[PDB]
Antibody, heavy 223, light 213 residues
Framework: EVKLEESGGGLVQPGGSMKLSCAAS????????MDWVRQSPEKGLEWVAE??????????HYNESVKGRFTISRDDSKSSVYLQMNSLRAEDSGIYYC???????????????WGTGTTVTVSSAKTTPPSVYPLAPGSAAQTNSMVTLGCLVKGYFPEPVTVTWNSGSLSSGVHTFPAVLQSDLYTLSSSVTVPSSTWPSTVTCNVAHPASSTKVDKKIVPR | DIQMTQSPASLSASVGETVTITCRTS??????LAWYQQKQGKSPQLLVY???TLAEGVPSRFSGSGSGTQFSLKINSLQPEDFGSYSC?????????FGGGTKLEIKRADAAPTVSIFPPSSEQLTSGGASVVCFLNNFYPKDINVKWKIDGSERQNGVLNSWTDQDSKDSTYSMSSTLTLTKDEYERHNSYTCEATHKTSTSPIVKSFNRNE
């Protein structure tokens, strides 16, 4: 089990600092060259930094964009790798993956192992719990064999929220939509489709927001 | 910095078909190229390095080719597992840089969207805001348009739209449109309407409701 576990991500305002960590397992981290790679919707994948065998080499390399601000670091006794990030900018936002670009051999510079990732968000927007609104159909509706319900998770920050149905026990026919940003606040919808006999008799969407430590359940009630 | 150019940005194909993604380069990199595969909600995974070498685990239906400034990834007899995002990356010399990726989508038969409209919940109305929501679910292909009408007149102002990524069960796309008004305006109007425009139909699919019923 070769494995890279990232940690340290979160929300910080522009100009602030953040230290990411990456625990390596299943191989000799001492003999490996480790990297941080970030991903965002705007720029796609971007290489950030690389630390080679220290310090016999010119060990550290940096994407031009983070020069002077970010420090990549190594502690082999802990079998882990770090990224100090100072003077953070909005465009430093993304999913930071910890990767490996060399273990052994004659080739290097491609990421043969990736972690899960940890998400950094750089913003002056304040943390805000969502409002959770039930979406019940109309009265006049004739109702087909299938029926669709929904939840509106409005006015929150930061990403992410976790949206499940009947405490996860309803997986199929559901659509959780990507959130959209308006006035430094996210809004997100989710729908779930079921047979007409099923509802009513009881559906409930589950909304958790880790950043504001809230967890709400709303039963969808007809009219 | 070396610039990487992938084509196309998005591409759909049937299971079984053969496909070719092109990766261009702004200055010669010889054969120092890597290809990655990223599945939905997953980390990238190495497919190819040194232009042609497959990694441990990668099926032989995958082949990489090219040298200099032009490179290709060819997938034969496309399988269900092969769909996802694909990106190239040079491993010539730092700074390492990636292409903008290519979304490889599944081609399926055209399906019409299941449209559903939802009045604002009463407990939203207490906060002074009103959101009318419409779901356009399980359609193909992704090209679709929504048209909101209040009392027979269109409204473009106050609308926000979001698309899901292609569905992993049935290869469709879904969409949510949300018209947000002020509660005071919401309650001065009776009829609210949702109109989907998809290639599966000439006339749009109309869902609506009356507030005063």
């Amino acid at each position: 089990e070769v494995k890279l576990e990232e940690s340290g991500g979160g929300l910080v305002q522009p100009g602030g600092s953040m230290k990411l960590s990456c625990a390596a397992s299943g191989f000799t981290s001492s003999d490996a060259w480790m990297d941080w790679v970030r991903q965002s919707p705007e720029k796609g994948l971007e290489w950030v930094a690389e630390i080679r065998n220290k310090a016999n080499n010119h060990a550290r390399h940096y994407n031009e964009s983070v020069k002077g601000r970010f420090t990549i670091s190594r502690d082999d006794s802990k079998s882990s790798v770090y990224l100090q990030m100072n003077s953070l900018r909005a465009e430093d936002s993304g999913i930071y993956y910890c990767t490996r670009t060399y273990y052994y051999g004659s080739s290097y510079g491609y990421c043969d192992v990736w972690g899960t990732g940890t998400t950094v968000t750089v913003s002056s927007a304040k943390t805000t719990p969502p409002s959770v609104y039930p979406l019940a159909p109309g009265s006049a509706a004739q109702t087909n064999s299938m029926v669709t319900l929904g939840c509106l998770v409005k006015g929150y920050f930061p990403e992410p929220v976790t949206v499940t149905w009947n405490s996860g026990s309803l997986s199929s026919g559901v659509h959780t939509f990507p959130a959209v940003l308006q006035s430094d606040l996210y809004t997100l919808s989710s729908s779930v489709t079921v047979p007409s006999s099923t509802w009513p008799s009881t559906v409930t969407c589950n909304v958790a927001h880790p950043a504001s430590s809230t967890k709400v359940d709303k039963k969808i009630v007809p009219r | 910095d070396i610039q990487m150019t992938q084509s196309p940005a998005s591409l759909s194909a049937s299971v079984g078909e053969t496909v070719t993604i092109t990766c261009r380069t702004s200055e010669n990199i010889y054969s120092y190229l890597a290809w990655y595969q990223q599945k939905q909600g997953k980390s990238p995974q190495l497919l190819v390095y040194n232009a042609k070498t497959l990694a441990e685990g990668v099926p032989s239906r995958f082949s990489g080719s090219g040298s200099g400034t032009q490179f290709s990834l060819k997938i034969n007899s496309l399988q269900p597992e092969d769909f996802g995002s694909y990106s190239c990356q040079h491993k010539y010399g730092t700074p390492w840089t990636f292409g903008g990726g290519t979304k490889l989508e599944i081609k399926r038969a055209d399906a019409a969207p299941t449209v559903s409209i939802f009045p604002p919940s009463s407990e939203q109305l207490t906060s002074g805001g009103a959101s009318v929501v419409c779901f356009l679910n399980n359609f193909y292909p992704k090209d679709i348009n929504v048209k909101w009408k209040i009392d027979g007149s269109e409204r473009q102002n106050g609308v926000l739209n979001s698309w899901t990524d292609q569905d992993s069960k049935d290869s469709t796309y879904s969409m949510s449109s949300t018209l947000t008004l002020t509660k005071d305006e919401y309650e001065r109007h009776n009829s609210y309407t949702c109109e989907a425009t998809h290639k599966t139909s000439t006339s749009p699919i109309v869902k609506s409701f009356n507030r005063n019923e």
